[PDB]
């Protein structure tokens, strides 16, 4: 459950348990992976803000009512009220997180200072050239995707990992290729492979719907056996299924992931393609931004190595009177 | 972030992100409020021009190296180079902006024409008696503080608003008076209040340091409880602190500001003392200056109502060749 209640503010990100969101009033959704939507369902009855692709997927697959889903266009600043009359406001800018379709970071600006919240993301130098991040503003808290914050874990770039996958498939001209994925993500990798090997990617109807939003080449189909590359759920890649698949057609299987996965069959390949920043990329990202502090988004994973990258700490800003009133609840008063 | 890159020139004002300032070479700081120093810290390593009081404050609180700070005396014309071959120059005159300690307007003159850049300012008729503005020169672009440029927002003069505050404090002789302020500014109001009520103003050590530069009466102290008027950060004025303060001493709180703030406690008062020209003041200012063009400095806020006061436009002046080489990236 990798979401956050931002302290001293009415802001929640990827956090949907109202029982525990005592003072939260403004709700944000970075992307549609299940660990960022725990407790989010058709019963949701509060305004939430997200990217247009996330807004489409959220209504489509979790049946949150459209009236509560406020799509904000990525890369445009938006003013949002922090009290009942918009006396106090903040600016939020969504920025591409380069993690999966719809994934964004949130730059929050208001009485509380400047907060960058990465959500899940994969850093690239182009990120630091975003206009919203090139104005010299000091970031006070950086909420960081620390999924791969392990100095022992080295990863190639996505481009290099994709190259390794191309090299491997070239050695298997007569093989079907199972690509084991999560429900959302890596569609751009599927497109690169379909173009390289002049073949169709076979997908489920749910993933074909999503691909329509992405502006990718016309290389995807639901038609069974229409091409050599088959997008499958990552859990389907196992020894037992290799033995079933091979009764119809020679098959190899690829798990593009940073996770450490023992290969149980000679034709199952684990290749460290990743949609999260590597440790070295996190170090570059934080050293460039020099925030006053770093707070991990992923509670169960390590976060460290940025002590010498921080700017001098700043005192906790006072909450404006009007926002205090907005965050209050009659349930926390007597009578 | 209310700074500007003046187009067709190497001039920047209150604009410090170098990566955006590829062709800017002359940097100016109108005053030390944080929305005018976004990106300016001890990493700054270019010449920087400002008023003497701004220079003292910039080094003290942002740790810009003295070697980069070029204080220019207010009200004096200064010739500044626009290249590195001793050819093209401009003249800059700093004029009192009447906004806060150290605040200035910049009159720029050169190949680009005559540009008046107000920064933040509060207009007064004395402003127009400035010798630099009484020579009949035609201002081509007036960069204007449009914070309060709303025909519906009517404001008293600072003197009238101060009088309202005096009237309020007279009703509570047994009370401490919290005055919620920004980090810089309104020290003259604190002085007037201490003299009116024959008491001391309790300040932070930082603000006491600044007061030493202003030539104000010996009415300020950092000694706790040493007087009835307490300068506090404006964010501290809130319902919760009224309940805390009154457990020690009866307390009134005053927010001197033009912002529309709802009072959450009977004894919190918002009084429209402002350090920004009102709309009616902006109109008299522009109407007296008749610039070719008015460009707002506060892009997040509305600006208009001046087309009746503009002079006929002029074509974009040519950049001299030597200055292009200076600006080259
Ligand atoms: N702690 C945990 N438990 C179970 N399933 C999880 C967990 N974290 C992520 N996931 C699943 C959910 C997503 O569909 C997929 C990609 O998550 P990503 O975070 O982008 O790598 O991984
Ligand atoms: N041992 C283990 N158990 C459960 N989840 C794990 C484990 N190791 C990594 N992960 C998760 C972490 C990320 O959510 C995903 C890798 O993201 P990717 O884009 O695939 O690199 O796999
Ligand atoms: N857009 C914005 N965001 C956050 N804080 C701001 C902003 N504008 C001004 N300020 C703060 C900064 C100054 O210290 C104070 C007086 O600004 P003055 O411009 O003289 O009225 O108000
Ligand atoms: N709605 C709103 N939100 C945030 N800031 C605002 C708003 N309205 C005005 N202001 C700011 C603008 C100036 O910085 C300050 C007034 O300057 P002073 O000298 O205090 O009159 O208050
Ligand atoms: Fe996640
Ligand atoms: Fe300002
Ligand atoms: Ni994710
Ligand atoms: Ni100001």
Residue numbers in the entry:
A (entry chain L): 1 to 335
B (entry chain A): 1 to 329
Q: Can I see the authors' text?
A:
Human SNM1B (SNM1B, Apollo, or DCLRE1B) is a 5′-to-3′ exonuclease, which was first identified as one of three vertebrate orthologues of the yeast DNA repair nuclease, PSO2 (4). SNM1B is a member of the metallo-β-lactamase (MBL) structural superfamily, of which the β-CASP (CPSF, Artemis, SNM1, PSO2) nucleic acid processing nucleases are a subfamily. All MBL type enzymes possess a characteristic α/β/β/α MBL core fold that provides a scaffold that supports the active site, which coordinates the metal ions essential for catalysis. The SNM1B sequence comprises 532 amino acids, wherein the N-terminal region (amino acids 1–332) contains the catalytic (MBL and β-CASP) domains, and the C-terminal region the protein-protein interaction regions, including the well-characterised TRF2 binding domain (amino acids 498–509).
The two 2′-deoxy-5′-AMP (AMP_1 and AMP_2) molecules are bound in the active site and are arranged in a position consistent with that predicted for the terminal nucleotide products from hydrolysis of a ssDNA substrate. The first nucleotide (AMP_1) is bound in a well-defined pocket formed in the cleft between the MBL and β-CASP domains. The 5′-phosphate group is located at the base of this pocket, and makes extensive protein interactions, including seven hydrogen bonds via the main chain amides of S258 and D275, the sidechain hydroxyls of Y182, T257, S258 and S274, and a single positively charged sidechain of K186. Two 5′-phosphate oxygen atoms (O1 and O3) of AMP_2 coordinate to one of the metal ions, whilst the third phosphate oxygen is positioned to form a hydrogen bond / electrostatic interaction with NE2 of imidazole sidechain of H276 (motif B; β-CASP domain). Although we cannot be sure of the Fe/Ni distribution between the two sites, analysis of related metal ion binding sites led us to model a Ni2+ at the M1 site (according to canonical MBL nomenclature), coordinated by H31 and H33 (motif 2; MBL domain), H99 (motif 3; MBL domain), D120 (motif 4; MBL domain), and a water molecule. The second metal ion (M2 site) was modelled as an Fe; it is coordinated in an octahedral arrangement by D35A and H36A (motif 2; MBL domain), D120 (motif 4; MBL domain), an oxygen (O1) of the 5′-phosphate group of AMP_2, and two water molecules.
